[PDB]
Amino acid sequence: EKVDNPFEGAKLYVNPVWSAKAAAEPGGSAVANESTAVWLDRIGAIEGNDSPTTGSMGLRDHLEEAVRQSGGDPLTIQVVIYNLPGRDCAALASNGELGPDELDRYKSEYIDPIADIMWDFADYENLRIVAIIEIASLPNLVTNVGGNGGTELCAYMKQNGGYVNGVGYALRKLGEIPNVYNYIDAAHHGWIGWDSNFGPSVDIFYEAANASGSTVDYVHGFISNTANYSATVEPYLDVNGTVNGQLIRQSKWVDWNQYVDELSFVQDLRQALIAKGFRSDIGMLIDTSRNGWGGPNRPTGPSSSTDLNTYVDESRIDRRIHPGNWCNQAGAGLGERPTVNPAPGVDAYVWVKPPGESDGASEEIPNDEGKGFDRMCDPTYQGNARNGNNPSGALPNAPISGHWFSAQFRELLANAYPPL
C-alpha cells in the first residue's frame, strides 16, 4: 500500500533551519530552497535542543512544517536516524552520546519517542517520511572488525549485536507506520566496492533486516554515498576498460575495486540484495550533496595519455588523493540537485548530508556531543594503511561535525556540477 517510490509525484521538504544558514552565505540563496534531510543526531534533537547541529526545531516541529509546506498534496521529508550505541565505531568525529552498551536506551529513549511522534502524523495521507537508517554503521562490521587496521569498538559492536539489533529495531518500529519509508545505509563504492567487502555487506544488511522482529518487508531500499564524495558516474573512466593493454583496475586510484562510481555500484548492489532475499521492488538512493566535482579543475574529456595512472588521474572527476579520504574534502562541489528516478533502479538522487555542515573538527574542540578529534579531518595528517598512507585531503579550520562550515559551503557552491 505504500507507494513504490516515495519521491515520485511529491514536493520535497525544505528545512528552514538549513535554508537560513545557506541563504546567509554569499551566493547561498541559489541553493537555499533545495531539499535536505533532517538529522536526529541526539535524543535531544527529538524534542528540540537548540544545538549547533539541529537548531530550534524538534521532530514534531519539522513534521508540522512538512504538513504546512505540502498544501495537502504529496510531500516527502527525509529524516536521518543516527544515534546507535557506539555510533561511528571506526572513527572519532561523529561518536555519540550512547555508548556501546546502551542498546536498551537507544530503543526506549531514542527510537520509541521518534516512532510515537511519527505515529501522530499517520493521519496525513499525503505526508511521506523517508527514514534513512544509521549511516556508517553496518559496513564497519565488515571492514573494521578483526584482521588488521580495524577497531576494538567495531569488534565489540559486532560481538554484542548492538548495530544489527539496533538497526532491526529501527526498521520494525518505524516501518510499521503507514507513511514511513525505510532506507538502509549502504556505504559507498570506495568503501565496500571490493570483492572482499561487497558480499559480506549484503549478508550483514540481510541480518539486520531480520533482527529485533524485523523482516525485509520493512525495507524500502538502500542509500549510498551518504556524507561522502564518490562520483555518481565517471564519464571518462571505464572500470572494465584498459589503457595500453593494461587494466584500469590496476591503477593506484581504482586499486582492484569492482567499481569506479556510485551508479554502477548501487545497480549491482540492488541486484545482489534482491538475490539475497530483499524485495524485488527495492530502489536505491545516492546522496549527491557533495559529489559534483565541478569548477575549473573538472576534466572536460578523457586523457590522451597511454600511461595507466596518468590516464586515470587526468580522467577521473573524483579528485581525491585516495577514495578512503572521507572528511571535509578539499575541492568538492555540490552534485546533482534532488531528482526523481534519474537512472535504472535508483529512486532518487538526494541531499542527505546537508551542504555546509562539517564532517568533523580539524583540531581538538571541547563539546558535549560525545565527539572526538579524528585526524582524518586534520589537513596535516599523513594518513594510515587504509587511506594508502596519504595526506587526509581535509579542509583546514573545520568545526565539529554537523556544525556550520562557511568555507566548505562556499567551495561546494563554487564547484557545483551541473552548474547552477
Ligand X SMILES: OC[C@H]1O[C@@H](O[C@H]2[C@H](O)[C@@H](O)[C@H](O[C@H]3[C@H](O)[C@@H](O)[C@H](O[C@H]4[C@H](O)[C@@H](O)[C@H](O[C@H]5[C@H](O)[C@@H](O)[C@H](O[C@H]6[C@H](O)[C@@H](O)[C@H](O)O[C@@H]6CO)O[C@@H]5CO)O[C@@H]4CO)O[C@@H]3CO)O[C@@H]2CO)[C@H](O)[C@@H](O)[C@@H]1O
Q: Residues in the site for Ca ion, rule: CB under 5 A?
A: 4, 281, 283
Q: Which does 167 bind (CB under 5 to 8 A by kind): Ca ion, ligand X, none?
A: none
Residues 6 or more apart from 401 whose CB is under 8 A from it? 53, 93, 94, 357, 358, 359, 360, 361, 371
Q: Which does 119 bind (CB under 5 to 8 A by kind): Ca ion, ligand X, none?
A: none
Q: Is the dihedral of CA 152, 165, 200, 260 positive or negative?
A: negative
Residues 6 or more apart from 104 whose CB is under 8 A from it? none
Residue nearer to ligand X on the CB measure, 70 or 201: 201
The DSSP line for 288-331 is -TT----STTS-SS-----SHHHHHHHH-S---SSTT--SSBTT
Q: Which does 359 bind (CB under 5 to 8 A by kind): ligand X, Ca ion, none?
A: ligand X
Tell me how far apart the alpha carbons of residues 290 and 333 are, in angstroms, rounded to a whole number: 5
- Residue with CB nearest ligand X? 324
Contact 118, 129 (CB under 8 A): yes
- Shortest spacing between CB 168 and ligand X, in angstroms: 20
- Shortest spacing between CB 172 and ligand X, in angstroms: 23
β-sheet bridge partners, residue 81: 40, 133
Residue nearer to ligand X on the CB measure, 179 or 404: 404
Tell me how far apart the alpha carbons of residues 292 and 130 are, in angstroms, rounded to a whole number: 23
Residue nearer to Ca ion on the CB measure, 237 or 346: 346
- Helix axes of 162-175 and 195-209: crossing angle, nearest 10 degrees: 50
- Shortest spacing between CB 77 and Ca ion, in angstroms: 18
Footprint of ligand X (CB under 6 A)? 39, 41, 53, 88, 90-91, 93-94, 135-136, 143-144, 188, 190-191, 194, 196-197, 226-228, 255-256, 323-324, 326, 353-354, 357, 359, 386-387, 401-402
Residue nearer to ligand X on the CB measure, 226 or 291: 226
Q: Which does 191 bind (CB under 5 to 8 A by kind): ligand X, Ca ion, none?
A: ligand X
Tell me how far apart the alpha carbons of residues 142 and 158 are, in angstroms, rounded to a whole number: 9
Q: Which does 291 bind (CB under 5 to 8 A by kind): ligand X, Ca ion, none?
A: none
End-to-end CA distance of the chain: 37
Q: Which does 137 bind (CB under 5 to 8 A by kind): Ca ion, ligand X, none?
A: none
Residue nearer to ligand X on the CB measure, 95 or 182: 95
Residue nearer to ligand X on the CB measure, 262 or 357: 357
